C-alpha cells in the first residue's frame, strides 16, 4: 500500500499492476500515482499515433486482465461523444496539451436537450476520474494549434459504451476500437 513516485512510464505500469492485483480499486491512490508520473514524451512516442480526422485510441497495457491502459491522441479540434463508462472506473491523465471536460447528468427518459452540469480544463500532467455514478462526460481538444495526448485507464476493461445525443438524451451502443496495440497499427 506504499505509493512511490513512478520514475518512468514503465515504472508506472509496474506500480499499476501492483495496485490492481486485488478485486477492488483504491481510486484516490490510483489517481495520485497517475498524477505523480511526470509525462516524458520520449517514453510514450511509440503509442502517440495520430489520425487527421478523429482522435485515436492506442493500447499500451492490458493490466493482466484487470485494466486497459491506453494513450489517446487528439488532433486540433478533435473531441469525443458524450458517453458513459460501462460500470467501470475511468482515469484520464494529460500527457501533452489541454483537454476540455464537460460533465452531463444521466438523461431522463423524456426527450430533452442535455444541459451541461459543469466544465473544466484539464492541463498537462493532471489526472481526472469519472464513473457512471458521477455522470456522463465529453472530452475535447478545443485547441486550434496544439495536439493533445492523454493516458487513460479503464477498470475493469470494457470495449463498448454508449454515445448520447446532446439534443435528446437518446443513447446508442458503440464499439470501442483500437488504432494500435503495443505500438503496432491495428487496422
Tell me if 135 sits within 8 A of 103, measured CB to CB: yes
Q: Identify the DSSP state of 174.
A: E
Binding residues: 83, 85, 137
Tell me if 100 sits within 8 A of 121, measured CB to CB: yes
Q: How far apart are CA 8 and CA 19, in angstroms?
A: 16
Q: How far apart are CA 31 and CA 15, in angstroms?
A: 12
Q: HEC profile for 54-109?
A: CCEEEEEECHHHCCEEEEEEECCCCECCEECCCCCEEEEEEEECCEEEEEECCCCC
Binding residues for Fe cation: 83, 85, 137
Q: How far apart are CA 43 and CA 6, in angstroms?
A: 13
Q: Would you say how long the chain is, in residues?
A: 187
Q: How far apart are CA 71 and CA 183, in angstroms?
A: 10
Amino acid at each position: 500500500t506504499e505509493l512511490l513516485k513512478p520514475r518512468t512510464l514503465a515504472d508506472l505500469i509496474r506500480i499499476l499492476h501492483e495496485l490492481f492485483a486485488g478485486d477492488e480499486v483504491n481510486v484516490e491512490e490510483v489517481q495520485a500515482v497517475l498524477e505523480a508520473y511526470e509525462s516524458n514524451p520520449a517514453e510514450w512516442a511509440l503509442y502517440a499515433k495520430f489520425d487527421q480526422y478523429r482522435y485515436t485510441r492506442n493500447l499500451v497495457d492490458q493490466g493482466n486482465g484487470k485494466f486497459n491502459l491506453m494513450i489517446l491522441c487528439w488532433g486540433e479540434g478533435h473531441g469525443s461523444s458524450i458517453h458513459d463508462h460501462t460500470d467501470s472506473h475511468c482515469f484520464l491523465k494529460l500527457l501533452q496539451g489541454n483537454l476540455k471536460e464537460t460533465l452531463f447528468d444521466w438523461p431522463d427518459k423524456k426527450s430533452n436537450e442535455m444541459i451541461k452540469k459543469s466544465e473544466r480544463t484539464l492541463r498537462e500532467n493532471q489526472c481526472a476520474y469519472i464513473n457512471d455514478s458521477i455522470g456522463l462526460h465529453r472530452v475535447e481538444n478545443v485547441s486550434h494549434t496544439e495536439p493533445a495526448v492523454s493516458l487513460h485507464l479503464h477498470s475493469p476493461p470494457f470495449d463498448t459504451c454508449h454515445a448520447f445525443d446532446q439534443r435528446t438524451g437518446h443513447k446508442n451502443k458503440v464499439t470501442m476500437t483500437f488504432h494500435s496495440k503495443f505500438g503496432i497499427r491495428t487496422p
